[PDB]
Amino acid sequence: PRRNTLPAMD
Amino acid sequence: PRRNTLPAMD
Amino acid sequence: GAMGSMERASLIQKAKLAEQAERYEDMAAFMKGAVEKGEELSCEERNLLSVAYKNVVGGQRAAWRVLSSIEQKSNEEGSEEKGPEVREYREKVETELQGVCDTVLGLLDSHLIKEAGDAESRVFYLKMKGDYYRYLAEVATGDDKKRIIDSARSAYQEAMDISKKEMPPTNPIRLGLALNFSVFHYEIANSPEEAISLAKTTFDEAMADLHTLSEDSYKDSTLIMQLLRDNLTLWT
Amino acid sequence: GAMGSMERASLIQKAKLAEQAERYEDMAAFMKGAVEKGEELSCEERNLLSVAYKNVVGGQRAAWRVLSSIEQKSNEEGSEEKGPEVREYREKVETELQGVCDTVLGLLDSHLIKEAGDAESRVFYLKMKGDYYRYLAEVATGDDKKRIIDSARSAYQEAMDISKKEMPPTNPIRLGLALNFSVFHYEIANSPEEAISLAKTTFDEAMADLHTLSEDSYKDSTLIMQLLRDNLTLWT
Ligand SMILES: [Mg+2]
Ligand SMILES: [Mg+2]
Ligand SMILES: [Mg+2]
Ligand SMILES: [Mg+2]
DSSP states (O other), rough: OOOOOOSSSO | OOOOOOOOOO | TTTTTTTTHHHHHEEEEEEEEHHHEEEEHHHHHHHTTOOOOOOHHHHHHHHHHHHHHHHHHHHHHHHHHHHHHTTTTOOOOOSSSHHHHHHHHHHHHHHHHHHHHHHHIIIIHHHSSSSHHHHHHHHHHHHHHHHHHHHOTTTHHHHHHHHHHHHHHHHHHHHHHSSSOOOOOHHHHHHHHHHHHHTTTOOOOOOOHHHHHHHHHTTTTGGOOOOOHHHHHHHHHHHHHHHHHHHO | OOTSSHHHHHHHHHHHHHTTTTTTHHHHHHHHHTTTOOSSOOOOHHHHHHHHHHHHHHHHHHHHHHHHHHHHHHTTTTTOOOOHHHHHHHHHHHHHHOOOHHHHHHHHHIIHHOOSHHHHHHHHHHHHHHHHHHHHHHHHOOOTTHHHHHHHHHHHHHHHHHHHHHHTTTTTHHHHHHHHHHHHHHSSSSSSHHHHHHHHHHHHHHTGGGGGSHHHHHHHHHHHHHHHHHHHHOEE
């Protein structure tokens, strides 16, 4: 489960 | 919910 | 051809890498390059070709349906005029889709089908021919729509005739061909009764042949039988 | 530019159609065409640009990671030699990725950033500059890797300085910038303590400002705060 960056893919 | 044909998309 | 300088084996290797990377446009270009080497395709290579182009055209068809739906709402009464952009962009996606279908049909015609002598390869390629004429038919609106539809029908019919004579009723290629030809009847040929009849006869004849199969063949055939049953449930 | 003959408004209209169709390569080409008209972008147009290229580069990055992983297994001891194909195809995907990053950075440099005077636009574009240098850094292995990393850092740092001075701590652009700069520290700059410190300070300062917000602004800010918290949970 990957860490979050923004924006995210569709 | 669409009817099925083959092959199906990933 | 941009793949003319790459080894056939390397093209197949990279097709498999592209599949794992979900790079289906690359996968299709690699497999086109492999076909253009001129040698016949093995069973696994045929399926790489089919998976690659099905994913490419699947994205295009999904996009075309979204854009077509927007275009149709705009042509309702009370809809605000918004200019030519929706039609233009739908046409752009449609043209690209038609180009992919033409590319696949060109590979089948030069020269996959004429060299395919075994039932498994000939039925596979004729099913593909029916499928990609069917996707052309989904977007066809002009004077050659009837001819496009009849090209799909003719390809499917020859594939059906060979598969009935040369393959057991549980053969996964025979089953997928019948599934797709049934959908052709239902939503292209305006023949829902034929679609239902074909799906039900195909299912019943496969059921009666399952007892001849290994565990792994049983799993392969019953998976597709469930798709036939799902379509029948949707249509009845 | 292939979009030079299309109206700016039509390019934006078709970008929105492409988004609905999940045609993100088209979306990005349309938005590149809109940027090259030379006028500044509105808030909604900036977000169209970002969404389009993020989806394009996201497919490439996912593919590169799959191919990189396969390449690394092949260089383990006991791994069977399979030729240059994995490296070649990884390099092909990498080059295409780098080209997309270079395209975005070129748009920011000619001339989006130099015309961006408001905090919301300048911070947005500098965040984008940091992001696309960061994606270049993810695949960089050579003599300019340190310079690529410092370009990302410098862009993020100027965006942070402006956002701290000119935006409330709950501003969604400020929050997303801090989220991404925190990830930059964690996995590009080898600075996990800085990454954790930034995420926690950003979260805490946003929490203390939520009371000033409308219901809709509260929903926008708390969504991103949850991403910060999720990263902190992963890292601690
Ligand atoms: Mg070549
Ligand atoms: Mg009836
Ligand atoms: Mg033009
Ligand atoms: Mg510590």
